[PDB]
Amino acid sequence: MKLMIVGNTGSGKTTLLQQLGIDVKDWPILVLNVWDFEEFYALYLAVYDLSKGQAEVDAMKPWLFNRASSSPVILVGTHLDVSDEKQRKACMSKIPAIRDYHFVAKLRKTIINESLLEKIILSERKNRKRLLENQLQLDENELPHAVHFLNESGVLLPKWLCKIMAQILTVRRDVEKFLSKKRKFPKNYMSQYFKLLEKFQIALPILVPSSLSDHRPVIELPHCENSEIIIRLYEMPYFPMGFWSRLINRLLEISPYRPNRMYWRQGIYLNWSPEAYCLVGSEVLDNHPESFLKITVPSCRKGCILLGQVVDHIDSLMEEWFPGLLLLKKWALYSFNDGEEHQKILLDDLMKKAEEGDLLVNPDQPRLTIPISQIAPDLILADLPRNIMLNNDELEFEQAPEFLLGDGSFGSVYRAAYEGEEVAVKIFNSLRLLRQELVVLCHLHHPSLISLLAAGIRPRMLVMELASKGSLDRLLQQDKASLTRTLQHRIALHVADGLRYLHSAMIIYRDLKPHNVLLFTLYPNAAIIAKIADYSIPGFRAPENQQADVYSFGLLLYDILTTGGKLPDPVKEYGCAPWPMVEKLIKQCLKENPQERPTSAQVFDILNSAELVCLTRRILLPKNVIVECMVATASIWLGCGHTDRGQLSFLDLNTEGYTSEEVADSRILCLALVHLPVEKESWIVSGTQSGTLLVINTEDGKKRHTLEKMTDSVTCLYCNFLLVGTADGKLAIFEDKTVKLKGAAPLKILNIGNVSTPLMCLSESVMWGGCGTKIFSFSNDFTIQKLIETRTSQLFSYAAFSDSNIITVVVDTALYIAKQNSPVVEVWDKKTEKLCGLIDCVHFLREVMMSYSGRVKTLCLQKNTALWIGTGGGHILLLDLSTRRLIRVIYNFCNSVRVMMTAQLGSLKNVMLVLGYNREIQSCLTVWDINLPHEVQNLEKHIEVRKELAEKMRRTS
Amino acid sequence: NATDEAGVTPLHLAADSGHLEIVEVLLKTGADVNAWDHYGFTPLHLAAHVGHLEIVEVLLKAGADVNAQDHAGWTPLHLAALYGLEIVEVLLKHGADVNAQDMWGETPFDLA
């Protein structure tokens, strides 16, 4: 237990301590750490001087008002030898909770009586906290429990306290050099200087609340008559100590739509232009030994708004810091005629009257009355924005449990109509709750925040947009069929864009859950789908702040990826479709360490990417497996060349059941599929380094054979006829019916080049292909139609790239050809046999964010004029063929790209399969939605339109 | 000397084409022997890639460094061994590092 000594100034606390900032000492008895008491304010010892009698006893109540958990307090009067008996009797008459009284070794015995691996740490450490030598069990993991233990015991933090901290009371520009920059104050602690003062009520983001005096300066008001000034006096028995520092702190963010700011220890005077000002000084009334915090405001519109803001701040301080006063009594002054003495009423009256009407009828002069808004313009919300007061002639409202909205799950909210349109009405059965909620709502204008349409007075209601489609919770539970992937991403994006807005406004939004997500439409391309709400009426929260919000949003994103359901993997647990880059984001937000969770801006930035939406799968093959080619059947066949003998791999795109088998004595470089509907069969042909074309039945692996061997390495295969391109510049044409025959000879052998010029690519639009530096075309008779020599491309580009091997060719209207170890893709006109275009991958990669190579490794094409280009690094350039513009640069998934091609899944969904390398070496398969460029453009337009709308609502308010 | 739209100097082009006379005259007049384009290729990089031995020799005599790394991290030894090894021998006679690694961790004798 801790013994702490407090009392009035000069009461003799240290004198008692000898007879038994805030300096701390050790006192054994039950060994107690004793503090000698200001800033930021066990067993309590209340010390007062008896020489002033009850005059010293009074004003002690703040000591009971101020962080105790109902701990005992001991009251002692000192200097009894110099006090009078009548003063002591007054002290008796006067007398959180006091246990016993004394008036001076009785004090020490009273203290002893009232004071009457197990955390064995902070002994060597007191005289980075892990292992100072691991104490206890892993040093309690440095959990907040240990921090609270060390702070409460007063052993670690108070080294600088009362010696360096809190010395500015008598001692941030021109401030640090005298307070915390004397001898040894490293620049590592600039962020803590003049910031730890803020938490301790010592400095304010304006200032030490001690240079102020208790002498009120001269105050002059532009208005003087009773009928033109609203005066509010909250009276509190005591002004619970520490009140004025916090009040001076908060009364800065006050706006009528701070030219002059005077202040002292008890009082501030804020002055804008005339008919806009507020005096919040503290007045002393004769024969009233209480504190009178008085507010004097002009009666105009800006006066009403300013008084409302000041009162809101004061009751906010009451609710947040000094709950004990909520006793404090509020009054308002009035005068029926000018010159009459100001008369006062408690606020419950004029509240009943604002409910009943808008006039204060004089009891004796029935014809003489005052409107309420002229007396206290907060009971009638005369502070509402001009477009927010309810027009009772435009509201069709039925208050019955038949049009109840959400069946009351949203609180007391009913369906209604406002200005014709269908609308929602929340009926407030206190005025404090309504005013607080209005203050919060009037400063929140963003697309994902529920918009406020009206705020009534006589009903005392709120009226807001009717989400026609219910909340997100009902979407998740009832109509699961309409929850498409695009809609899920839009909902999550919309919630994050607005959680980050609340965090920008320094608003916590403690509990975020699906119930607080309101849906206006289910059409994915809409501008507004989901907003966030708080009806003010649990498994969706952090283990315990913005990190709690990020954890809540991670749970919400988990419950969006999953339709509905430490925390298990969503795909394995619920069988939902995989969604990479959202599973990772869920894992990131759900980190148990608050400092490792991403901030809401980072979360939204992660969600704002089309790589996140159209990345269907990302499969990592076993480590040290190197595969060079694939063919899609869904299922994928891969050619493993990680050793001197090629192997055949099979990957099931639904189960991820990778398997492999040694099939050839040489490395496999090319694969293809021969389909024979006429027999209803299919073969897989493997072209290896030795030149062996080895054929497998996909239905049963035992049926295997081999065609006629070529004279050199087989470089490419295509499939009706089978075309085989070898490394010695030869093309072998087989009939597909001959593939099933062991040792079958090709239908034709055609020589394109020589041994040093290998034929490497074959594609359809008339057959087209590439060998060495030449492009060749064929008719249906398998004869040469044209040869285009591409070494003239050396007249452009550079000879290092142009004079190389052709690795892939695609053609719809132009020849898009890529070379070996070249970042330049050349575009040839197949009708004129002349080079007409260049595409530089380095040029594209430089415009977008040392870890890049840019050498083209593969190409692929879509019917929607789209060209996919894989670079040597882990980059895919998506381009529009209309103008060869850059649609997107996919990157930051792996380190290298090997080959990609289009495919169709078993669900008839078109995807793009990209095989690359994580260069120790781990080959990777990536699955993209075939419509990725369109999603990129659509989401860019969606973000642009939504940002434009957000700016519009921010400007218009 | 000036760079083109791809950052390529006349010395880069001469190294690509293998012109002994142009490389020699540019080095004699004071061309930047270690200038690089957006690809990170130095004169010696291009000479090793294309396969010109005498260009490599005249560049090394003019002060070309054998430890330059391009955008892909490939030293002139990498481009010399990748395309075949007289140029490898000439570069190794100079103080070249055979343990240099590119972005994928490959030494230039692994490319051969």
Ligand SMILES: Cc1ccc(C(=O)Nc2ccc(CN3CCN(C)CC3)c(C(F)(F)F)c2)cc1C#Cc1cnc2[nH]ncc2c1
């Ligand atoms: C009828 C009604 C009244 C009020 C609100 C409201 O939310 N107000 C409100 C207040 C404060 C804040 C900000 N925070 C909150 C967390 N605080 C901790 C920090 C500050 C927010 C927000 F969070 F939004 F910013 C919203 C919504 C509705 C509604 C509705 C409705 C409409 N349409 C529907 N259809 N089916 C059902 C249904 C229901």
